[PDB]
Structures are given as structure tokens and as C-alpha cells.
Write a structure and sequence with these properties.
Two copies of one chain form a homodimer. Chain A is mostly beta strands. Chain A folds into two domains: 176 residues, no CATH class; 162 residues, no CATH class. The first copy, chain A, contains no helices and 22 strands. In chain A, strands 3, 4, 5, 6, 7, 8 and 9 form a seven-stranded antiparallel sheet that branches. A six-stranded antiparallel sheet of chain A has the order 15-14-17-12-20-21, with no helix packed on it. At the A-B interface, loops of A face loops of B. Bound molecules: a molecule of 2 linked components (GLC-GLA) (2 copies) and calcium ion (CA) (4 copies). A molecule of 2 linked components (GLC-GLA) binds next to loops of chain B. Chains A, B: Keywords: Calcium, Metal-binding, Signal. Chains A, B: GO terms for molecular function: metal ion binding.
Chain lengths: 338, 338
């Protein structure tokens, strides 16, 4: 169904309403459990009138986990001290989450905790969490436990080992929404010897995976001194800090061809813009695009620098000022939580 | 270099200045030659200040030929009574055309004739023809005779068998620039029982071959009752005949993503638009797009129906009224010569 949602400020999945769950082989919530691998399933149905588009996921585990969405493996992680961020495109009405958790220390606690923030076509969103509504088994995961087509109608409920505020684990640290390590500060080639002239500069990067279906994009960005961000010609947002980064979700990507454009301005001295972009596809894979030398850049901004299709003849390759961590900006950027 | 050339009316390549050439084993022009296969090469260099983009080609032979451009085989044909159309993308400055011709009847004349109309980045055009400036050999085509890297500086000239007006062959008929045969008359789904309401309708078809580099597109189009054609949102032209088809060349295609849009109007009774589109890629292949059900269509034309990227949500599949040749329009369209 029709997608009304427009680019907006990124909205985090939070763990404070989720519960730790496990099988209940030991009925003491948070008691000791054996080394084992156990399966967990959760079905979700769109409310009448709207279609689910994509999801933001934070997951932590004692001890480890493997995360599937509609049968596609989307991540593996471990540890209860820090959560792990995942992004996945969804089907319009029915969606299946499946986690294979592992207890790797004998006679130790066990549990998985996840928060799934589901975004709908009209712009609203709903948080689903780990709780007793997840199915589980008191045995190792059968073949294809993660496929929607496996029948779990008779599986028992998962057993809650503890709420977010409990006496066993404590609040897991939320990861950054997206990493900047691996992205680069870029600018036009008039940035030389640590400084750049005063004024504005434009940057383009197009993503065109013609055999896949693009769905959602998450964007983390910062610039010295300020920026405005456009996707397919539409304004997403603006910022003016090179010490506090901004994050946006773009829920209306064109399905095959999308162009991100930046208009960054230098107020004086050093200049630079840095961004990490993650696009989710309908097949369950995703793509990370960073600011680097493949971005196109220009010093005199033509009118219509932000439309998707333009003649990129007079544009240069963006110059890399430095990988994230370079001076003066350093490694201390404040990054929104996933 | 920068492409200034804009959409324009298609310009036919003509044979009227080209000559029949062969090896000269028999020194009498147009005389008898033996059953054999013989090679022909021709180099072209772009004039100063402009870059060569693509070429339209008509070729005929006594008796048969295989046609290569920069080593890529692009067609095979035969016969001196009617010429054969080819379309190929070119490299900016140097290009090598090579033909392996065959005489298949003993003690019979032999000759190949070609006209190559090259279009430059600025919109100008120049015709290269088969003549004595082509290299040949008095032997079978060596291995890799068609590669640009093969050395022909010591090869002898080809021998002219006759001009366009000569006493052996006579003027070969020019083929249609493109076939309409195989394309379909399409319309919106309100066209039923041989008629459709009065009014305007919109149609879109996108070509996005993301691993190739698109260069030129040639378009053949007609409509009942009239149409206007757009490429990437830019106007190409308009026409108003279902008995006379129009041909355009588009020399400024975007290299990866191009959207064709038509706004057609029906004045009453039967309605339909039909088009064949040929796109050339830098690797020497081409792609033919025809009007069919994969075009998107809509009955109320939204503003911005012709921009490349739009939300194609409310658009239906185009309805096929019939393959070319169906009544009322019949098989008699007047089609520009290649
Ligand atoms: O380090 C990059 C930054 O350098 C210049 O601004 C630095 C400012 O840092 C502190 O805010 C300090 O209080 C100020 O006095 C100082 O100007 C430059 O103006 C910025 O555009 C940016 O390149
Ligand atoms: O066959 C399609 C054609 O049908 C209608 O054509 C009728 C008119 O055609 C000639 O213009 C003739 O001179 C007129 O006498 C005759 O009324 C329709 O009008 C056309 O738009 C077209 O659909
Ligand atoms: Ca444990
Ligand atoms: Ca600065
Ligand atoms: Ca012959
Ligand atoms: Ca009509």
C-alpha cells in the first residue's frame, strides 16, 4: 500500500520495556541453565489500514544469538553488556522474527532481550519486545525453525527470566545507530593543508542496485561547519555541529535508484562532511555506503544540484580529508543511540 | 568531453556518396571474383574540439558480410538489393570499423558498401563511406583482423568496384530505421471494443541496466491520435499521425538510468501509441525496448508524470490493443529510412 511517510529524525529502539526471556527448563527466573541452543519465534501482523515497511532492532544475549527475519539470517552476536543494532526491511502484513540463543557457560543464567521498532507506511511506528508472546522449545532448534512455514502453533510460551530493571543482568548499553569508524571526512579539493575557503559545497552519491528492491535508509551525518541533506531531491534535514552527529530515517526510498545530496558550508578554517548510510533491501540484505572518494563534489553549486538525474560532467571526485579519527575532529563524536 | 547535443529528429545515413569496394584480385571494377572471404578495415579520428559518441550504419554486400566495431561483432547480413541497419556506440577519439565480406558464387562480382553516419558530442554529424581509404588484404581474414590492435599500416587499399550509380549493381534500397513489427499498439484499459474515450493519457517505461554504460537511443513512434515524447523529463518532440511514424535520436542519455514518457491524446474512436526503442551500450551491444504491457499507464495525468523518478503507485499496466499490423491501422506505416 501507498507510502505516506517522509524523511524524519531517527527514532531509536529502546530496551527499557523489553524483558529477558528463555525456555524455563529451570523455572526460577534468572536461575542456572545448561549449555544449550534454543529457538525463539515471534509473529507480527500489521494493524488494519497500514503496511509495515522496515524495522530497527537492538538485541543482546546471555550468551549468544543468531537473528532471522522472515527466514533470512541477518546477524549474529553475543553478550548481555552491550546490545547490537540491526536493520531489516519487512513484508506488508505478516512478519516472523526468530532467534537461536545459546547458553555457553554451564550452570549459568541464560536469556535473550530484543527491541523491534516497526515503522509503518503512514509514518507511525510500534515497538515489539521480547516477552512471553514469543514461542520457544525446550530442545535444540529443529531444521528450518526460522522459516515462516514451520508450524509453531503448539509451541509453548517463552519464560521471562527478568524485566529490564532486574537483579541478574542490568541495563545493556545501546550501541551507536551506525558506526562512523570506516567513514571519511570529505570535501572539495580546495581543502588543502588543513583549511578550506569560506562557502558552501555540494556532494552527490547514487545507489542503484537494479535487481534488488530498496526500502529504508538510515543516515548518520555531521559536518564542519553545517550541512543540509537531500534524498532524491527532497530535503531530509540540516545540522551545524561537527561534535554532535545527526541521524535520520528515510522510509520512502525509490525501489531501484536513489541519490543522496549534501550542501555543506564552511564557516572558516577546517571543513569537512562525514556520513554513514545503510540501505535495507527486500531480500533481507543491506548495504553500507560511506562518504569517500566515490562521492562527486563541486565548488560552484549549480541550480538543481540535488535532483536524482543530472549530468555529473563538471563534478570532481570528493577529496578525502581523513578517515574518522583524523585531526582536528578526533574520535569523540556524540552519536545517537540505535 | 561534455555532451552539448540534444534530442533531435533522426537523420538518415545515406548510401548516395558511398562506393562498392573489394580486393582487386580481378583488376576490372565489377568483374568476376572467386569464392572467398576477404577483410576490410577503416579507422576514423574525431575532429579537434569534439568527441565522437555513436553511429548509424547502413551496409549491403555481394554476397555476405560480418560487421565489427572496435572488435565487437555487431551484425551479420547479406544481399546487395537492400541495405541493413546497425547502431553502435563509439569511443571518444579513435574507432576501428572492420568487415569480413564473402563472395559465395564462383565467377561473380563481389563488393561491400557501407555508409557510417557518426554523431559528435556537440550535435554535428559526418558521413564516412566505403571507399579506397579502407585497408584490405588479398587473402583470407587473418586471426584478429578486426581488433584495433592488429597492425594494418602496410595493408594495401581496397579496390573500388563502382560508385552508387554504376552498371553492375544499382542503388540498394534503404531499410527502415527501426522495425515496428514486434511492437504493440498500447493504451490505458479504458480502450475497449475498438474505441476509447476522448482525452489524454500517460505512459512510462524505464531502462536501468546498471552494470552497462548507455550512450545513444533511437526512437520510432506513432500514435492515434497524437503524442508527445519525453526522455528523463526533457521534451523530445510531438507528432500527430498513425500513418506516418517519427524517428528521433537521443545522444545525451544518462549512462545508467533513463525514463521514457509519452503523453498521448485521443480525439475520438480508436486510440493507441506504438513505439520501438533501440539503446546502445559502450560494450557494443544494444537493447530493443518495445511498447507492451510492461509500460505503466494512467488515465488522470499527474503533474510531474515525466520526471525520471516518481512514485509509480497509482499506475496500471498498459493494455495491449494489438501487435503491429492489427486493424484499423494496418501494416502501411510510412517509416523513415535508416
Ligand atoms: O576544529 C575545527 C573548527 O575550527 C574553528 O573553530 C574552532 C573553535 O573551537 C571552539 O569552539 C573554540 O571555543 C573557538 O574559539 C574556536 O573558533 C573553525 O572556525 C571551525 O569552522 C572548525 O573548522
Ligand atoms: O482507424 C482509426 C481512426 O478512426 C477514425 O477515423 C475516421 C476519420 O479518418 C479520416 O480522418 C477521414 O478523413 C475521416 O472522414 C474519418 O472520419 C478516427 O477519427 C481517428 O481518430 C482514428 O482513430
Ligand atoms: Ca550463561
Ligand atoms: Ca570550519
Ligand atoms: Ca557474388
Ligand atoms: Ca482516434
Amino acid at each position: 500500500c501507498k507510502i505516506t511517510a517522509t524523511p524524519r529524525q531517527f527514532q531509536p529502539a529502546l530496551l527499557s520495556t523489553s524483558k529477558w526471556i528463555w525456555t524455563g527448563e529451570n523455572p526460577i527466573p534468572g536461575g542456572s541453565n545448561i549449555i544449550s541452543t534454543r529457538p525463539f519465534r515471534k509473529n507480527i501482523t500489521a494493524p488494519c489500514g497500514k503496511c509495515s515497511v522496515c524495522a530497527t532492532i537492538v538485541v543482546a544475549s546471555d550468551d549468544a544469538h543468531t537473528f532471522y527475519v522472515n527466514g533470512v539470517r541477518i546477524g549474529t552476536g553475543a553478550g548481555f553488556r552491550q546490545g547490537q543494532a540491526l536493520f531489516v526491511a519487512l513484508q506488508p502484513t505478516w512478519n516472523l522474527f526468530a532467534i537461536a540463543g545459546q547458553n555457553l557457560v554451564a550452570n549459568s543464567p541464560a536469556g535473550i532481550m530484543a527491541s523491534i521498532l516497526v515503522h509503518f507506511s503512514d509514518g507511525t511506528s510500534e515497538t515489539f519486545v521480547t516477552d512471553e508472546s514469543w514461542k520457544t522449545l525446550r530442545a535444540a532448534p529443529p531444521e528450518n525453525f526460522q522459516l515462516p512455514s514451520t508450524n509453531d502453533s503448539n509451541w509453548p510460551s517463552a519464560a521471562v527470566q527478568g524485566a529490564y530493571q532486574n537483579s541478574v543482568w542490568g541495563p545493556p548499553v545501546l550501541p551507536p545507530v551506525l558506526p562512523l569508524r570506516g567513514s571519511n571526512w570529505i570535501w572539495t579539493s580546495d581543502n588543502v593543508n588543513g583549511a578550506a575557503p569560506v562557502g558552501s559545497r555540494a556532494f552527490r552519491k547514487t545507489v542503484n542496485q537494479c535487481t534488488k528492491v530498496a526500502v529504508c535508509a538510515t543516515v548518520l551525518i555531521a559536518a564542519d561547519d553545517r550541512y543540509t541533506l537531500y534524498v532524491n531531491g527532497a530535503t531530509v534535514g540540516s545540522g551545524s555541529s561537527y561534535t554532535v552527529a545527526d541521524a535520520y530515517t528515510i522510509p520512502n526510498l525509490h525501489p531501484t535508484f536513489n541519490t543522496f545530496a549534501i550542501n555543506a558550508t564552511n564557516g572558516g578554517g577546517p571543513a569537512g562532511v562525514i556520513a554513514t548510510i545503510l540501505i535495507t533491501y527486500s531480500d533481507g540484505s543491506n548495504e553500507t555506503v560511506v562518504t569517500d572518494a566515490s562521492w562527486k563534489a563541486i565548488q560552484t553549486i549549480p541550480q538543481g544540484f540535488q535532483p536524482p538525474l543530472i549530468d555529473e560532467f563538471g563534478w570532481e571526485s570528493a577529496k578525502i580529508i581523513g578517515a574518522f579519527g583524523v585531526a582536528p575532529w578526533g574520535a569523540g563524536m556524540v552519536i545517537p543511540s540505535a
